[model samples]
Target: GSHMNPPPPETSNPNKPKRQTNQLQYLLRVVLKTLWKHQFAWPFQQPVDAVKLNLPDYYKIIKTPMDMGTIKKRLENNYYWNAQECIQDFNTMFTNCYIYNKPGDDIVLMAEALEKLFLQKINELPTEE
Candidate 1:
């Protein structure tokens, strides 16, 4: 059993410096996970619910099908970036639009909902005269 303790109070910690393992295996693990999220759309996309947002011009430099160089620097400094925050924001929109403010970003539900919407849209197209 592993019990994690809360960070010491700000007054007690006093600008405590952080440390890293920098071990070969640990670095490899971090790289793999980081790239997995950065590269794979299914596991890592939809961080932004673009349609629900009804807004654009966010993170112009970052995108899916993106270049590793774009995210490499951020990953080198930290294992994660703003991905979770973006997903949480999308979750709020999702609840408001569909679930009436229920929390939790259910990836499977999101995917199915997207698929259904797209299929319905495609079906509406005119086949021919």
Candidate 2:
């Protein structure tokens, strides 16, 4: 019998962290769907129409626009690697509303309420390292 044999074929890494990804993905989807069904979500559901709204400076003021629709698409497309990324996008949407709308504006108020709601929902999720 031969004393030496060929080395075994290399296999992919066995310690990959895919399990946590599925957990976070499902949690994010549920939270986002809840937000979409919220009454205050209308204003932030879709992208702003600067041309139709006749706000020429809208795009200028809000350089990076964020919306719930875009977030949903990103989530579906696997653009987010973790829950924090989704949270960041939600924060960006509210921040844009605050930056573009005047203080005490109706839209600003909606954004504020929705942001509080988002925080509540996010906090309810189990923490992950």
Candidate 3:
């Protein structure tokens, strides 16, 4: 005979149930993901000095001339995990892409600020009710 059963939750079993957080750890994940995305962008730009290398340099190497679509896509998916990563990477991609793209310094500052704000919001997120 075929058996049918639903797995029991902790209360029904002697073992503990897995702990789950209702809140999405969005900001923290976004920050780390952004760090990785930058790792993929920096190389396509001008080569950087190895002595001064950091995460941003790595992103610069991976930068490409054809990333405009990705730029817009990353802009829209600002909160998606990898998308967030790409935006952060692309955010750093420009000496001032946010500024140069929009042709305004204030908008560039605002764009940069938004990236930080989103990261901050994600990092400071607490558990859901």
Instruction: Estimate the TM-score of every prediction.
Output: 0.23, 0.77, 0.25
What is the per-residue lDDT of model 2 for residues 1-129, given as tens digits with 9 covering 90 to 100?
121222221222345332336536655566788788888889777788676667877876887788887777666656655777667788889899999999999999888888787888777776565
> Order the candidates by TM-score, highest first — what do you get?
2, 3, 1
Question: Which is better, 2 or 3, measured by lDDT?
Answer: 2
lDDT of 1 by residue, 5-96 (tens): 22211222224433333332232344324333432225333243333444343233222222223233333444332343222333333333
The parts of candidate 1 lying over 4 Å away from their true place are 1-16, 22-40, 43-46, 49-74, 79-106, 109-129
lDDT scores of the candidates, listed in order: 0.34, 0.71, 0.39
Alpha carbon lDDT at 82, candidate 1: 35
Question: Candidate 3's residue-wise lDDT over 1-28, tens digit each?
Answer: 1122112111222242222233323333
Task: Tell how far residue 83 is off in model 1, in angstroms.
Answer: 17
Order the candidates by lDDT, highest first.
2, 3, 1
